[PDB]
């Protein structure tokens, strides 16, 4: 359950990130693949090397999904329903991997938001990504 304070914090961090969100998504994916190499097996057909166009394009898709979630924060199950289906049924994404990507998304924000990433905002972002993760694992099947 995301609080009014949490929603304002996540909105503030989104704003500061601005037009870098795609690039940051790409960075978070690289951080994940290097830090948690088990995650790589989900992208056997991607080239995962640094500067990969496929990782860049995917980063944008992920960032776009998260922003759809922020923009529909009070109706996330509905907004992310198609993605929930995809990740559970087709991709069979192991639930642990959502915590790994969530951590890498936080790390990327921390590396780029010296002023914004306070203890309170870090908390709110953690809750937001945990809420997104809960939605995206809601389907198994």
């Amino acid at each position: 359950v995301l609080s009014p304070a949490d929603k304002t914090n996540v909105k503030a961090a989104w704003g500061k990130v601005g037009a870098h969100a795609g690039e940051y998504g790409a960075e978070a994916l690289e951080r994940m693949f290097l830090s948690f190499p088990t995650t790589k097996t989900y992208f056997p057909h991607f080239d995962l090397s640094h500067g990969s166009a496929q990782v860049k394009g995917h980063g944008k898709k992920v960032a776009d999904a998260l922003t759809n979630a922020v923009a529909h924060v009070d109706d996330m199950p509905n907004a992310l329903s198609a993605l929930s289906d995809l990740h559970a049924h087709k991709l069979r994404v192991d639930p642990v991997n959502f915590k790994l990507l969530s951590h890498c998304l936080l790390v990327t924000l921390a590396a780029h938001l010296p002023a914004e990433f306070t203890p309170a905002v870090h908390a709110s972002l953690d809750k937001f990504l945990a809420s997104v993760s809960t939605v995206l694992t809601s389907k198994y099947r």
Partner: protein, 146 residues
């Protein structure tokens, strides 16, 4: 845990720049704010009612200092984390009964603090190397449960 020389290089070069009086308290404060169940083990610390109360709590800073001292310790003994962490494992597992999932959490919070403080310098490979480290520490601290 086995770090490659590149991983060792990434880890030690960064750590030499860490403010060892501050970073431990920052990681501990964030642990208490983000994962507030952990406040269960720190009732004696006093005011933990807000983020500001936690981060400015002098007991949080003082205790975080000791925690970072232990990370510093593991960094000097990567190939013998088990030995380094034996008495802390006895403490955290046999006496305190902290679930070891929280060791992983504190390690990840530390990583977040390092990223916040170092910015672009905390590159994806630098993070990777630190992930191996904090996993190694968590696993050694959890040895009494294994």
């Amino acid at each position: 845990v086995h770090l490659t020389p590149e991983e060792k290089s990434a880890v030690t070069a960064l750590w030499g720049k860490v403010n060892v009086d501050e970073v431990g308290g920052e990681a501990l404060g964030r642990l208490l704010v983000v994962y507030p169940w952990t406040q269960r083990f720190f009732e004696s610390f006093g005011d933990l009612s807000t983020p500001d109360a936690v981060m400015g709590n002098p007991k949080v800073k003082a205790h975080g200092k000791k925690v970072l001292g232990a990370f510093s310790d593991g960094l000097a003994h990567l190939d013998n984390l088990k030995g380094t962490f034996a008495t802390l494992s006895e403490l955290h597992c046999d006496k305190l009964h902290v679930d070891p999932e929280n060791f992983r959490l504190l390690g990840n919070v530390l990583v977040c603090v390092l990223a916040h403080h170092f910015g672009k310098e905390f590159t994806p490979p630098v993070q990777a190397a630190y992930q191996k480290v904090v996993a190694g520490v968590a696993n050694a601290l959890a040895h009494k449960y294994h």
